[PDB]
Amino acid sequence: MERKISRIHLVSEPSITHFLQVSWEKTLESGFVITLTDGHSAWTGTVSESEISQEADDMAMEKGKYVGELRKALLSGAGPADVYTFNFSKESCYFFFEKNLKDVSFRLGSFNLEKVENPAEVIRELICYCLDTIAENQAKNEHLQKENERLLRDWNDVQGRFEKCVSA
């Protein structure tokens, strides 16, 4: 159940940053659940394989390229020169994202999100997941540092032993 949290700036409200959480089971192709929050309200939607296939067919391109573009846009995997614009109509709860290219734009995708009666629960879940991953990464880094220190010490000792033996 892979998850990814990214920060975006909607054109409608550029003075604040929204958080987009995308969760998928195995791969983005199969489907994913997205959640857009701003600290006070949350909107959750789901996209299935059928919707992705229909969008790819409508845009008339291979599924792989569309999946790659979706990964670059939603998961914040953009390259050195790649601008993506996210629009969200709150009154209609319609969230779409497009790729900006000079003076032209491509409507990369669109979904119809729905409000959740308890944004607090999802906010707390997101914060708890962030804290858990932070702790896990810190523990892994500490273990790796310990291993590196041990390896360095052993390497130095073996180097000294070799220095003695070469002259012996």
Place this chain on the structure above:
Amino acid sequence: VMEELEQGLLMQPWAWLQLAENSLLAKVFITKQGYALLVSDLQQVWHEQVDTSVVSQRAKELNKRLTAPPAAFLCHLDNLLRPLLKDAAHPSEATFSCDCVADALILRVRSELSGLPFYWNFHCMLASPSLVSQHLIRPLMGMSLALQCQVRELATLLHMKDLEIQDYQESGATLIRDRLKTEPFEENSFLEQFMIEKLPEACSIGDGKPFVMNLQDLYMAVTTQEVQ
């Protein structure tokens, strides 16, 4: 506005186009206010002049998700087309396909910009007799006349060089390299030899490639002179 497109198309050279094991000769002039295209296959000629409004109308229907102004679309199309027309054997990211329905040629170009698809179709109807004449017949006759004048100048220069060589031969010495001896140049004999030996290959238009590769500067100069 409209006249500028016609003048630009007239002042443009022919380019070779390859598509689905087929060849075409294309002249394209694209500006922010529209474009003009003329495509020939040595048997028929099709022409298309297009303005910004129709560009937007066709683009919004071909690329549903593309939100672009006519100027940007035209600039992108020009940047995509000019490199291919200028020369071949380059990173051609565009695929071309031509089809005839009843009397008009539909030329579809499909490419990718920033990895996203981009389509454009030229619906070029048969060119009018005046346009075809002005673009092919008169320039070709002018080029032929200019080449004949060049041949006459070359013959005169050869005659002068032969006179100098004869001066040396009659009053002078012998060449150290006997292999360099050259026969006197006779216009009638040279023309006869050319006609019976190399005319069949020289006059082989083929699919239009030799016309583009060999003489295009002369065509441009003749067209410019005709304009003035």
Place this chain on the structure above:
Amino acid sequence: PVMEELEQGLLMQPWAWLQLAENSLLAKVFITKQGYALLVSDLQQVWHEQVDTSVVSQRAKELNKRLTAPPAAFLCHLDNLLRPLLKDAAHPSEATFSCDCVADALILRVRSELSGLPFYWNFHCMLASPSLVSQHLIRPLMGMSLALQCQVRELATLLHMKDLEIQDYQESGATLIRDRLKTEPFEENSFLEQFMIEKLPEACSIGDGKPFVMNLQDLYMAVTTQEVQVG
């Protein structure tokens, strides 16, 4: 088959200059006992016509009544009247020519005196099809241009060989006697640069088409024959 022979004959024939009452035209006519085929142009539009014995007889009866002639005799007389004019101009003709450019069609009226009696004919030439126009004007002209370019290249190579021979003569302990007979080295780029700015404006003027018929007809005929033989 008769139509095919007429088409082949028209293709073989060379262009000729015709001087009407006010204007001028480039024309190619091929007449046989089975009918005729004509192609006229004015460097802006091309008109074509092709008629068979029946059409010829109907037109002869409707235009010049009181004349009872078979179509073969009428075609032979038309050939006798037209061919001398096309072969050479500015000679005793006594055959008035006129043109009327009706909407999307042309009418070429020819009037003559046949043994001292009136003889009228009209060519109803409609706009020529793109295929015929291309085959008759465009491809032959491109072939002629390519052949002339090849001739220019050959002459340049000959000039280069002559320059090499002159250099050998000069280097072989020689001394030119007549200094005036001194040809400078030949450079293709310099010659082209001089030509394009000195003679192209006057050498690329087609005018009314007279230079085309007066200069580039043998090459045109050869190119057309080669194209026919190829296919």
